Amino acid sequence: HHWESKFSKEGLTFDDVLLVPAKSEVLPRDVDLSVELTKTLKLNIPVISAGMDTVTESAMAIAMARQGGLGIIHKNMSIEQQAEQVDKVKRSERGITNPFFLTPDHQVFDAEHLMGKYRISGVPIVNNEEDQKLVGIITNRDLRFIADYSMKISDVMTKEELVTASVGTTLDEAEKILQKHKIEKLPLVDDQNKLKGLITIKDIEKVIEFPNSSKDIHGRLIVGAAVGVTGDTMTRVKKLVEANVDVIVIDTAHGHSQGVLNTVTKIRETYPELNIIAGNVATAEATRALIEAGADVVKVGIGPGSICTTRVVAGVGVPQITAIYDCATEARKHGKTIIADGGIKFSGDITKALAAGGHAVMLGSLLAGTSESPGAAAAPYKGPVEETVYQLVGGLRSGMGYCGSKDLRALREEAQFIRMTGAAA
Amino acid sequence: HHWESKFSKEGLTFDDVLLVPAKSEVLPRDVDLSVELTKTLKLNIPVISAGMDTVTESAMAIAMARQGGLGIIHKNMSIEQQAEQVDKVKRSERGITNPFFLTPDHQVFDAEHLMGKYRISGVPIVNNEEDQKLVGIITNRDLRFIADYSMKISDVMTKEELVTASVGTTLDEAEKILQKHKIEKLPLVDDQNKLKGLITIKDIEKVIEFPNSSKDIHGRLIVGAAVGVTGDTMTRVKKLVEANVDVIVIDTAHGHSQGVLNTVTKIRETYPELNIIAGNVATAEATRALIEAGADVVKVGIGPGSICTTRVVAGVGVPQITAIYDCATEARKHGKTIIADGGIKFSGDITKALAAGGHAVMLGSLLAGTSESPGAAAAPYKGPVEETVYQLVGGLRSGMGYCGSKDLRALREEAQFIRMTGAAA
Amino acid sequence: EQVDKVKRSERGITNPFFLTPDHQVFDAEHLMGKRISGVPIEEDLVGIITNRDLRFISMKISDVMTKEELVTASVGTTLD
Ligand SMILES: Nc1ncnc2c1ncn2[C@@H]1O[C@H](COP(=O)(O)OP(=O)(O)OP(=O)(O)OP(=O)(O)OC[C@H]2O[C@@H](n3cnc4c(N)ncnc43)[C@H](O)[C@@H]2O)[C@@H](O)[C@H]1O
Ligand SMILES: Nc1ncnc2c1ncn2[C@@H]1O[C@H](COP(=O)(O)OP(=O)(O)OP(=O)(O)OP(=O)(O)OC[C@H]2O[C@@H](n3cnc4c(N)ncnc43)[C@H](O)[C@@H]2O)[C@@H](O)[C@H]1O
Ligand SMILES: Nc1ncnc2c1ncn2[C@@H]1O[C@H](COP(=O)(O)OP(=O)(O)OP(=O)(O)OP(=O)(O)OC[C@H]2O[C@@H](n3cnc4c(N)ncnc43)[C@H](O)[C@@H]2O)[C@@H](O)[C@H]1O
Ligand SMILES: [Mg+2]
Ligand SMILES: [Mg+2]
Ligand SMILES: [Mg+2]
């Protein structure tokens, strides 16, 4: 009876529904925004930057993970390029154990070279290349007090009221030492005053602004990489796994194809522990096919947005709220999660997408023209990506406060919608 | 079964419905617009100016009460400031028992001082500071007939055809005396011609234009004040009660919180007779929680307006017609009333809000740029607030005429709506 | 006064701006913004507060300034 059911289905989009306020005991700032996409992949904010070549490369993926989200390195480059991008994010936060140093024998020019080359403002000076023993430190404010000179750095450096800290001192204590002594550098020494590391004001400042950073169990920022369905994707996945990628995104325009299902299964059987995100699907039947094939997370998004290309060109699409809810309903029965990829235009759409069933939202166009987005080339400049993400999570926190949702699980399971007519807009 | 009811609710806004005409026996001018918010708080028009810092201070609250409505002094100032604003409205209409006078000893300059200082056009002249006995009156039209002079006011004042009235004469008789004798001042004297008061043309003119003024039982204009949920709100309420505030508005963005419920209850238990307006809520469950907590009037408004911030930022909102009706349905079961706060844009929306269940509508943006609105600073000038309120109540009167509603109770209980599709707009 | 202010300039300041340990850093920043970078710390010297001191501070109170390490010169000290 397929001829009769041809027009029996109804579809709700973001603009069709509003979230109903309920009794609340939680302020927006006390809301838990963490989400467990799988046992090995956990975010602190449910935001993922899309695997698009105008959205996510290493700079975006690092920024996203610093804020608690996740970045998916796009697949529109060769396999070597993509393994290097994943590796660049995994090695970003190295904690500097190897500090760049110098000796009183060198000239002041030597010090400017180091500062100007690496955008560094301080050089710790050790007694010899071998018994690295801290004798002094030289900095730009020191250079300001000298007319260009090659005098020995020893008569130029700071030596009398030299301030160090031991290896293992906390970042808080490091901050207070910098704040009291009115200095911005804090070399780390051992028992015998061997130079062992360096802590700077801006290392502490970046911990203050990114305390929810999402990291693997070894303290490295999480990152994902995009995979299609081609001949060399098994080689692409292999190099990405060798770069310690945290999750592979089998990314296709129509994931409910047998060629996609086979690609999911043979990656799963090759790497049983790997995290697999597979999309794009928009029905429960397709969600069940991807999970049965071996996918951990199902990405939802066929034709979202009122007048996107999929709808105008092919006539195909599923209103995103209905897509999220139907796919989430199927994914619950298997204990799997859902990523909502598509037409989020305001922060309120994030609250709607997550209520409805989505465990995380994927964003691209909203982050496409940001500072950490690839290239300096036709997208308007939207500033640092953390400005956009801050307001997006700010709205989500506000919505969960209205809904009395202390965590995302309560928003997904319990939040109620009210259907609108659209009449005033 | 919260997962299945996630999208079971429907919501109507103002643009979804029109009021159906019924058999009418009442003209718009004969419609009774009074409303009883509680036993101690009664309005002559169901219009309240919002407790917003761009809408209602003492000037707005006085104007609103003069027309039969109510003004809610906003909470964005300190406690002392807010008690002074409430007191300023309570002392506005003092009835002048203490008239500013002078004696024939003084110079004509003395009289100009008084007139220019207080925007006064007349000074009654008494024989001595003690036996205040009326001898004369001096006015600007008198000053016009003199080149600047310091001559004794006695050779300048009006004495031969001096017109007085007794204490206790009506305002009508005062008017006719002014109209016959072609004068604009009427001093009030006692049996022995002691100066006891003064009646002017513009005192009578303001009674003609504001005969529906809403007042407490002691003849003072009613006023309300806004309270949040902070540490010092109990001190704020106390000073406001000490300023003879008529109603406290516990004003929050999400009133269905336990911190709000507790604030309502401990104010109620502290002041058993005080009038409490608590909002903002948009469901019957929240209306029941506020009433049970001890609120007299429930303010309804979460996300009204098509593209307001609550909807765009948080994704939260309830279409206002549905919100009003569901909250009014609950409030009836407890014998309490409802204030409709939100997206009124035309006078016809007032008629819709009140039919549906609202006992009064709260307006802010429509009154934000009026003359009595705070500040001379980004809002377009909309003129005297009485121009806006006149057309708003004019539309409501027209709608009740179409509905055959002789009073607001008949509009609330009996008026029928017809649901529209929106198709032509 | 305007003429005298020009004639006395390029001398390399007998009447500098001053504060006391009772004031708050908010007083200093505004005195700075109105383009000086240092404010020596009543009627009858205890410290010095500068712009870089403000980086490690949060208007607080001005008594947490540069108070112990004070380098001062005599009146008559040459530019050299
Ligand atoms: N060797 C290295 N290897 C690897 N990464 C490195 C590195 N050196 C720097 N980095 C990295 O580069 C960045 C550090 O520079 P930034 O953190 O970016 O620079 P800044 O502190 O903002 O510079 P500023 O110009 O304000 O400081 P100032 O000269 O006044 O300087 C501070 C003032 O305090 C004084 N001072 C500093 N330390 C002192 C000490 N121990 N004792 C006494 N005085 C000290 C100075 O003389 C000066 O007056 C970080 O990313 C850091 O990890
Ligand atoms: N002492 C006081 N204490 C407190 N509040 C006070 C006050 N005096 C005034 N106010 C207040 O200030 C306002 C009164 O002034 P407004 O009411 O605002 O002024 P106006 O009458 O419009 O002034 P106009 O300029 O037209 O009048 P004219 O000089 O022609 O004047 C009327 C004309 O009639 C004549 N006239 C008036 N009274 C007369 C009398 N009893 N006998 C004979 N001639 C009289 C005059 O000579 C003149 O020609 C009200 O708010 C009032 O309550
Ligand atoms: N009170 C006043 N009255 C009248 N005219 C005034 C005035 N103050 C300034 N002016 C005028 O303002 C003009 C502008 O010159 P400045 O404002 O001096 O500008 P600058 O030399 O470029 O200073 P900068 O801004 O680099 O200082 P920073 O805090 O980085 O670096 C300063 C560093 O010095 C240190 N420091 C200063 N005194 C110290 C002390 N006694 N002991 C220890 N450290 C001290 C601070 O800790 C800080 O690290 C002057 O020419 C002068 O005419
Ligand atoms: Mg510096
Ligand atoms: Mg006149
Ligand atoms: Mg500087």
Side-chain angles (χ1 to χ4, degrees), chain A residues 3-118 120-143 145-147 150-380 382-425, chain B residues 3-118 120-143 145-147 150-380 382-425, chain C residues 1-10 12-13 15-16 19-21 23-25 27-41 45-67 69-80:
Chain A
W3 183 262
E4 344 301 338
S5 48
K6 214 132 195 284
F7 303 101
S8 295
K9 178 87 160 189
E10 301 188 60
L12 298 179
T13 181
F14 291 122
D15 295 86
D16 291 337
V17 290
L18 286 171
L19 279 159
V20 180
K23 197 185 194 140
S24 184
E25 318 297 337
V26 56
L27 297 165
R29 64 185 172 221
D30 300 318
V31 170
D32 181 12
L33 295 187
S34 78
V35 55
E36 180 178 321
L37 288 177
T38 185
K39 299 207 220 296
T40 75
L41 178 82
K42 285 147 186 211
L43 322 174
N44 282 325
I45 59 173
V47 186
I48 308 171
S49 68
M52 284 148 83
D53 51 87
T54 55
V55 180
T56 312
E57 274 164 22
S58 72
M60 182 46 84
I62 284 158
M64 293 312 299
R66 274 177 180 173
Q67 289 151 117
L70 172 60
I72 311 294
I73 307 286
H74 67 85
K75 70 196 169 141
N76 190 44
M77 67 191 161
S78 87
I79 293 171
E80 312 105 306
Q81 280 154 326
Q82 204 183 20
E84 183 193 359
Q85 285 276 313
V86 161
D87 180 59
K88 185 158 208 303
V89 182
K90 299 304 288 177
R91 286 196 208 268
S92 173
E93 301 308 312
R94 298 296 299 278
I96 295 100
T97 299
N98 198 247
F100 287 143
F101 66 104
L102 211 67
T103 76
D105 302 309
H106 285 48
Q107 275 80 355
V108 184
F109 288 94
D110 301 330
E112 176 173 280
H113 303 167
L114 283 183
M115 306 182 175
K117 195 165 195 170
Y118 310 92
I120 281 172
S121 174
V123 161
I125 315 178
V126 125
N127 59 357
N128 46 104
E129 182 182 39
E130 287 275 3
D131 181 356
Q132 300 116 342
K133 258 174 173 71
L134 191 52
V135 47
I137 189 180
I138 206 162
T139 44
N140 292 122
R141 211 228 181 191
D142 286 329
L143 257 53
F145 282 115
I146 54 116
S150 71
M151 292 177 72
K152 268 172 229 151
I153 56 186
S154 81
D155 184 1
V156 186
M157 58 162 85
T158 321
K159 293 179 179 179
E160 295 302 320
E161 265 308 284
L162 202 157
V163 177
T164 74
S166 166
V167 171
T169 68
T170 66
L171 300 159
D172 279 4
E173 198 58 33
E175 196 202 16
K176 303 194 197 321
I177 295 177
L178 298 182
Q179 296 195 300
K180 190 272 166 196
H181 295 87
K182 285 180 243 92
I183 51 175
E184 295 189 339
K185 282 82 191 175
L186 184 65
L188 300 181
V189 300
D190 71 344
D191 302 346
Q192 276 66 228
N193 208 57
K194 294 281 209 331
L195 192 73
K196 289 286 187 171
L198 171 59
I199 287 176
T200 72
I201 178 74
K202 176 175 266 284
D203 299 307
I204 298 169
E205 282 170 358
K206 310 288 81 164
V207 169
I208 284 169
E209 186 58 18
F210 312 113
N212 315 121
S213 86
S214 45
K215 287 169 172 151
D216 59 29
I217 199 64
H218 301 304
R220 288 155 324 173
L221 292 176
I222 61 173
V223 74
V227 166
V229 179
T230 70
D232 65 36
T233 52
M234 287 305 217
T235 309
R236 175 168 262 119
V237 160
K238 185 180 176 182
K239 300 286 99 174
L240 291 164
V241 170
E242 283 176 10
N244 305 303
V245 72
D246 300 85
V247 59
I248 287 298
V249 181
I250 296 165
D251 216 1
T252 62
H254 186 214
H256 194 31
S257 169
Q258 189 71 58
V260 173
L261 294 173
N262 299 322
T263 302
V264 178
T265 305
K266 271 69 171 174
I267 291 176
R268 164 62 74 214
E269 286 174 345
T270 306
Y271 312 99
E273 307 289 289
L274 176 70
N275 290 327
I276 296 101
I277 290 163
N280 261 351
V281 147
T283 66
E285 162 56 29
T287 295
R288 178 171 173 267
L290 282 182
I291 292 163
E292 277 172 344
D296 295 303
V297 191
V298 172
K299 205 168 63 127
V300 178
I302 303 295
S306 164
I307 52 175
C308 75
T309 73
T310 310
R311 296 187 187 192
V312 179
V313 176
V316 172
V318 177
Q320 183 75 339
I321 287 287
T322 289
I324 295 169
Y325 177 87
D326 285 342
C327 295
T329 301
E330 180 66 28
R332 179 179 342 135
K333 302 175 168 176
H334 316 292
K336 313 289 155 183
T337 61
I338 290 297
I339 290 167
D341 183 23
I344 294 90
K345 56 209 170 303
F346 312 125
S347 57
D349 298 338
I350 293 164
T351 315
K352 294 169 189 194
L354 299 178
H359 295 81
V361 303
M362 181 171 294
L363 304 177
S365 305
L366 277 188
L367 308 176
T370 61
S371 289
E372 292 87 336
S373 67
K382 288 182 276 193
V385 60
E386 47 269 14
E387 270 167 42
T388 309
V389 179
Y390 185 76
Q391 150 67 18
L392 291 172
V393 306
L396 168 61
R397 285 180 172 284
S398 176
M400 285 162 102
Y402 278 112
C403 294
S405 300
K406 42 158 165 58
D407 55 29
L408 273 43
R409 172 263 317 158
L411 180 73
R412 292 195 303 270
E413 291 317 281
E414 280 154 42
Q416 294 265 111
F417 289 89
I418 182 167
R419 284 180 294 105
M420 278 184 303
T421 55
Chain B
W3 183 262
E4 344 301 338
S5 48
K6 214 132 195 284
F7 303 101
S8 295
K9 178 87 160 189
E10 301 188 60
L12 298 179
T13 181
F14 291 122
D15 295 86
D16 291 337
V17 290
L18 286 171
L19 279 159
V20 180
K23 197 185 194 140
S24 184
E25 318 297 337
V26 56
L27 297 165
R29 64 185 172 221
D30 300 318
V31 170
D32 181 12
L33 295 187
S34 78
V35 55
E36 180 178 321
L37 288 177
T38 185
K39 299 207 220 296
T40 75
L41 178 82
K42 285 147 186 211
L43 322 174
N44 282 325
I45 59 173
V47 186
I48 308 171
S49 68
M52 284 148 83
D53 51 87
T54 55
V55 180
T56 312
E57 274 164 22
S58 72
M60 182 46 84
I62 284 158
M64 293 312 299
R66 274 177 180 173
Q67 289 151 117
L70 172 60
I72 311 294
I73 307 286
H74 67 85
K75 70 196 169 141
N76 190 44
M77 67 191 161
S78 87
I79 293 171
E80 312 105 306
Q81 280 154 326
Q82 204 183 20
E84 183 193 359
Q85 285 276 313
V86 161
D87 180 59
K88 185 158 208 303
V89 182
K90 299 304 288 177
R91 286 196 208 268
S92 173
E93 301 308 312
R94 298 296 299 278
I96 295 100
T97 299
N98 198 247
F100 287 143
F101 66 104
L102 211 67
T103 76
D105 302 309
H106 285 48
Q107 275 80 355
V108 184
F109 288 94
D110 301 330
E112 176 173 280
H113 303 167
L114 283 183
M115 306 182 175
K117 195 165 195 170
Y118 310 92
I120 281 172
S121 174
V123 161
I125 315 178
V126 125
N127 59 357
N128 46 104
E129 182 182 39
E130 287 275 3
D131 181 356
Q132 300 116 342
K133 258 174 173 71
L134 191 52
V135 47
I137 189 180
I138 206 162
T139 44
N140 292 122
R141 211 228 181 191
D142 286 329
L143 257 53
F145 282 115
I146 54 116
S150 71
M151 292 177 72
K152 268 172 229 151
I153 56 186
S154 81
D155 184 1
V156 186
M157 58 162 85
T158 321
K159 293 179 179 179
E160 295 302 320
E161 265 308 284
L162 202 157
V163 177
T164 74
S166 166
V167 171
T169 68
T170 66
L171 300 159
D172 279 4
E173 198 58 33
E175 196 202 16
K176 303 194 197 321
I177 295 177
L178 298 182
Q179 296 195 300
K180 190 272 166 196
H181 295 87
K182 285 180 243 92
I183 51 175
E184 295 189 339
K185 282 82 191 175
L186 184 65
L188 300 181
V189 300
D190 71 344
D191 302 346
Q192 276 66 228
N193 208 57
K194 294 281 209 331
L195 192 73
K196 289 286 187 171
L198 171 59
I199 287 176
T200 72
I201 178 74
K202 176 175 266 284
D203 299 307
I204 298 169
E205 282 170 358
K206 310 288 81 164
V207 169
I208 284 169
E209 186 58 18
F210 312 113
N212 315 121
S213 86
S214 45
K215 287 169 172 151
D216 59 29
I217 199 64
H218 301 304
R220 288 155 324 173
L221 292 176
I222 61 173
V223 74
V227 166
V229 179
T230 70
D232 65 36
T233 52
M234 287 305 217
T235 309
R236 175 168 262 119
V237 160
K238 185 180 176 182
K239 300 286 99 174
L240 291 164
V241 170
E242 283 176 10
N244 305 303
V245 72
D246 300 85
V247 59
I248 287 298
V249 181
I250 296 165
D251 216 1
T252 62
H254 186 214
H256 194 31
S257 169
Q258 189 71 58
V260 173
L261 294 173
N262 299 322
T263 302
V264 178
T265 305
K266 271 69 171 174
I267 291 176
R268 164 62 74 214
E269 286 174 345
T270 306
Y271 312 99
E273 307 289 289
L274 176 70
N275 290 327
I276 296 101
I277 290 163
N280 261 351
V281 147
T283 66
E285 162 56 29
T287 295
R288 178 171 173 267
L290 282 182
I291 292 163
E292 277 172 344
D296 295 303
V297 191
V298 172
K299 205 168 63 127
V300 178
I302 303 295
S306 164
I307 52 175
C308 75
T309 73
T310 310
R311 296 187 187 192
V312 179
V313 176
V316 172
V318 177
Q320 183 75 339
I321 287 287
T322 289
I324 295 169
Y325 177 87
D326 285 342
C327 295
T329 301
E330 180 66 28
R332 179 179 342 135
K333 302 175 168 176
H334 316 292
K336 313 289 155 183
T337 61
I338 290 297
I339 290 167
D341 183 23
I344 294 90
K345 56 209 170 303
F346 312 125
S347 57
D349 298 338
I350 293 164
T351 315
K352 294 169 189 194
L354 299 178
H359 295 81
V361 303
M362 181 171 294
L363 304 177
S365 305
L366 277 188
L367 308 176
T370 61
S371 289
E372 292 87 336
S373 67
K382 288 182 276 193
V385 60
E386 47 269 14
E387 270 167 42
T388 309
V389 179
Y390 185 76
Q391 150 67 18
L392 291 172
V393 306
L396 168 61
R397 285 180 172 284
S398 176
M400 285 162 102
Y402 278 112
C403 294
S405 300
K406 42 158 165 58
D407 55 29
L408 273 43
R409 172 263 317 158
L411 180 73
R412 292 195 303 270
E413 291 317 281
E414 280 154 42
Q416 294 265 111
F417 289 89
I418 182 167
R419 284 180 294 105
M420 278 184 303
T421 55
Chain C
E1 184 173 308
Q2 303 269 9
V3 160
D4 180 57
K5 192 180 291 213
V6 181
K7 298 301 293 175
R8 81 186 177 196
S9 189
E10 269 205 349
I13 303 300
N15 55 330
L19 288 173
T20 73
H23 285 128
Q24 315 186 337
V25 173
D27 302 357
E29 68 163 5
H30 277 93
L31 187 77
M32 306 192 203
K34 188 157 200 164
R35 297 301 317 275
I36 68 182
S37 297
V39 187
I41 306 298
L45 188 71
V46 179
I48 183 60
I49 184 165
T50 70
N51 194 36
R52 219 185 76 102
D53 302 349
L54 259 53
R55 195 248 175 164
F56 311 115
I57 206 167
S58 299
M59 90 296 292
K60 194 188 284 179
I61 52 173
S62 183
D63 51 46
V64 207
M65 58 217 183
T66 308
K67 177 155 185 161
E69 56 260 49
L70 218 188
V71 167
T72 56
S74 166
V75 174
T77 47
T78 72
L79 294 206
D80 166 82

